[PDB]
């Protein structure tokens, strides 16, 4: 595994390190979005930053499943639920939860 | 090891770290109907991990002030995914279920919420208030729909029954300060061996807060309540065109 | 034939319900074991949680030092049959002379236990039942008194044409069964079958009898359910000539070898109507007594 | 695509805003083929 | 013996007095995709009798002038019953196909009729009549839906093919002096062991006079060409909300 | 586990495709038995029903009467192999000096072999194809000229960056293969294999390559699949500075190791472009020749 | 945290079906990914330079 830069839109030098990580926060229930990538591995977007997208440049074609850890980083007093869904081909970006 | 948990259904999971065992209603779990208990003759259609999933159907906010809610099975899902087709299409249904409701708060928050299930849930009106009107419930009370319908009178569940008795029921409690999800397994409950999606809901389910919600001014105040659910078992019968009710 | 290995390895059509307890026979009340001191960590009986949904499984022999006791007390009184086996009042007819109701000699009850508090709340402690039934019917004028009198009561099975008459061809009764007899014998008793299209009657029904929209006008049929409704009990003077006295007849039913599934909680408001749950909402009242502090008797 | 299915709650003291590091790679069925030169070459001039 | 015939799938039965037999389509029974010629890892639904019977889509008149018809599959059923919603929620689709086209008349009237499966049946323009213009077919002309389209050159088969070769395909004839349907089942045909059933038509159906309808005036002049089709061993993955296209 | 009888005794799984008929060595064309003179009712051969769909299975030797033949005669040459293992043009790539096309010494040709009519019409006589295959690279000036110049071939597979000029640094080629020969030596020549995604190349693709609306602006997508792009074939003459020579590379493929599924109708009417079937409306013409009348040669 | 990556696998987190997987892993082994001749050096030797 290596850092999958989902928060890829800072692109001045002093906030690249930006790109690393992205937030969550107190909402209004109202089942918000929090982000959305594309799957795709060696396709430009955030898969670029992993070396598994930089090798998987180095070939034409691949082939398996994918896998995408994420580590919560605030404080231990703080709780929460999140959904994470794959959509396969054909379904448009989700409209809502 | 108890607190913590997987469930996995189709190409659904779901996972908890404060849970508190797992309830499988009257002890048994769903299966499928067999071949003495059932009398339509034609073979049933069993769509197995199409409908046999996780459905998160809806998000009611926790407040000092609320009173409590309830949803109608199979009626919150007739209109979703493959599983909504199936009980639109078929005359004949039936399946368990796997019920998660989902609410977290923090170290400091503190509240109960008692969830139920109640077969046979019928709604009854305050009777005009005075009791001399013979009013009944609308299409919208008896079958909510996704968004479920909030409790006039909890005390007597809207029924003229004494929510103090409905742990005769299967139910799990979720205590803040303890864990932060109930899980009910429902087996198919009826006193016929399959029956309609559209006109009868087998059993309800109850969410209501005995012990209110509290928190100091400062503490995160938007408290969700989400409710996920997965048929189990499911068959249909009796083929033709999509009615919805 | 089957062949990809998913379908080999499928659990799909088990018909078997796994079921994670099993009955014991238990024809007392449970003995108490003599127990004695413990001073343990680890061990801690007294501490439960709720949450899970369970009762709590600490006994007396884990809180206390208990003795020995031989418990031989009786467990069968409490059972189904026990509870239910014991006639009660669902039903009352009335054949006045000269009144608003029933002028014409003759009536149809339509059977329905619902309309009799004391009963109704007993069977509503479940959901569904099933059960075979002895109906006694006790007949006499308004003041108790006995006249010498013939009776015919009919059962009418749904889709039997219903007397409207004390003279309706319908009491030829050539099929339905009837009973004929005098207000001087004693009380007309017979036995009654589990009669439902169903496995058992339910006392509740969350749904709608048909299809189609369930527009206000119809909303009186939510609960409805035809498999609970078993038909129509006539009564008649027998004769052409209108009957000298006015009668009441009362009918008494007794269940036996009786099933029940589901159990739920017990009515703690009026019941106002047959046909539903509905309660007089402005006066909910609590489930029982009340006190002025919860730091006094 | 990621959602909130309950929600974020923190006690009185505790940052109303936390951060998600995301970690990428492949299962063990995962296999490439037909090897070709990346997209990027990464030289502007002659490397001196 | 061989004249007449029933044909029974789910709860739909077919049955024919003039029959010349069944075609199955390159030697070939319809059956599921194997554990080894498999990709996706996703456990499918098979459905089974709720898709797999017997839908009468359509209906053309034979006429006189009429030039020859064309159907694309599984397009013609993409939003019909519980098989359009599975194609519909489902990336992936595979299955093979019953096709039964009727057509009666009388021992008076004459003409024949050619029944085709085409596998990639790629349409092609007239490019402008002169051959400079680079036109391309209309989305409503290469996935017609179940109204089929009707062929503007049926010698060339719209496609720069003669129509004359295409016996080199599964087919039957309708004959009216013989037999009044045809009846062809086809297995799944494809270079992938499964594939969207909104993006890709595996094969297109054409019914084409060769032998022109006539008949005697007083003869019924109505002799109309009924299409039905019946899905075969369906099975479906990558399940998630419903899309049309 | 299993336990209701419909899905014990179902057949939903089954991947093993029952085949009606089987392949049988035949290396020669089939013999001819002696037939005699047969005057049956019952049997009759000569009668068929093309309805049916099947053609017909008389013989020669029961429509009249034949002698003994032995045939040798092989059928080696009509095996796929024998039928597409000759090589033939397929792509032709030109380097001119000033010209309107390629003025910058190197050039990129999209590998697709349907630019030319008779290497198209034999292969599209198949729906779907699985091959290796062997091609060939001759290069001279527009007069068929041999002249002392070097030059760079190299496969760019999809996703590989396109050289945009005779000095782009993708003609490094650390990854993608190059070749790099004289035009005075002999023509290149390499073995490539089956490349595509799919288990066989397509020549027909009824449909689309992504989902959406297929509005009119799209339309040009319309039986494109990916499956069949197996990228660039690029070329450039090996220097700085602009070659003395204008070059023409003729590419010629030759198929092997070939399996062929689906045959269908061949190609009646001129090809206008490559992506697609199209054909002149105004100028459809019957398969072959004509006559005046069909009662005279 | 623990430095490891995740052991979680297709059959665990959904239903899956059985899949023979054939596909090579040939192509990346060292010697396939670097033994392809690439550019490394340039020499001139010009005339009058
Ligand atoms: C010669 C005539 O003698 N026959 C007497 C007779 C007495 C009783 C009888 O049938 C009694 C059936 C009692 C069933 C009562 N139930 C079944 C469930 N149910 C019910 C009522 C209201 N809501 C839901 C269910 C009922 O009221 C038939 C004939
Ligand atoms: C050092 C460089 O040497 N490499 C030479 C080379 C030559 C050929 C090559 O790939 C040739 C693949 C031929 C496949 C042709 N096909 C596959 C199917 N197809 C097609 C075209 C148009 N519509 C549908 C399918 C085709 O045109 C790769 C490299």
Known sequence: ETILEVNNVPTNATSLMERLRFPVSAQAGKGELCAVFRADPGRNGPWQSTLLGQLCGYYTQWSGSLEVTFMFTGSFMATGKMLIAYTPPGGPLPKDR | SDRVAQLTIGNSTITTQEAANIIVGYGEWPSYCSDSDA??????????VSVNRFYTLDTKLWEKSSKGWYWKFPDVLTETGVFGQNAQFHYLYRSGFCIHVQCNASKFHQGALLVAVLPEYVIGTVAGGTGTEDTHPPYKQTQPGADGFELQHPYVLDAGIPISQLTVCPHQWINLRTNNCATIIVPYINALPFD?????????????????????????????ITITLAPMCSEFAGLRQAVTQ | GDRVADVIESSIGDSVSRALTHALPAPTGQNTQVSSHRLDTGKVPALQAAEIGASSNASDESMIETRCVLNSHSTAETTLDSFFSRAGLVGEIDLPLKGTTNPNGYANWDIDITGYAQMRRKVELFTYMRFDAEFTFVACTPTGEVVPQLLQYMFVPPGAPKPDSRESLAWQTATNPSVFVKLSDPPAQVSVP?????????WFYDGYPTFGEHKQEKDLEYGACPNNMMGTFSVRTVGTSKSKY?????????????????????????????????????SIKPTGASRTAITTL | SIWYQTNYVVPIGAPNTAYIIALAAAQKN???????DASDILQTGTIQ
């Open chain 4, 30 to 36: 995962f296999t490439m083929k037909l090897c070709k």
């Open chain 2, 39 to 48: 009398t339509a003759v034609d073979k049933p259609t069993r769509p197995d």
């Open chain 3, 246 to 282: 006015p009668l009441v007849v009362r009918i008494y039913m007794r269940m036996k070898h009786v099933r029940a599934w589901i159990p739920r909680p017990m009515r703690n408001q009026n019941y106002l109507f047959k046909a539903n749950p509905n309660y007089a909402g402005n």
């Open chain 3, 194 to 202: 589990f009669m439902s299209p169903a496995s058992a009657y339910q």
């Open chain 2, 196 to 224: 309609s999606a559209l006109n009868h809901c087998n059993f309800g389910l109850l969410v209501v807060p005995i012990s209110p919600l509290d928190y100091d001014q400062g503490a995160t105040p938007v408290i969700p």
